[PDB]
């Protein structure tokens, strides 16, 4: 069932933090999440998500 699990994520090209966005995925160093804006998921290093509750 919903909600889906929610990160914030850093925007390597611009700086800024985004989300909160569902987590698709993470591990071995890396995080993919989908924003409902997006027309694909986002993958980033895992080291800049962070939960959200």
């Given at each position: 069932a919903d909600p889906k699990p929610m990160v914030?994520?850093?925007d390597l090209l611009t700086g800024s933090w985004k989300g909160p966005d569902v987590l698709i995925?993470?591990?071995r160093g890396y995080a993919c999440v989908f924003p409902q804006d997006a027309?694909?998921?986002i993958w980033?290093?895992?080291r800049?998500?962070?939960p959200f509750t």
């Amino acid at each position: 069932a919903d909600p889906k699990p929610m990160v914030m994520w850093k925007d390597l090209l611009t700086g800024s933090w985004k989300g909160p966005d569902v987590l698709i995925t993470a591990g071995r160093g890396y995080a993919c999440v989908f924003p409902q804006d997006a027309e694909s998921p986002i993958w980033v290093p895992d080291r800049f998500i962070r939960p959200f509750t």
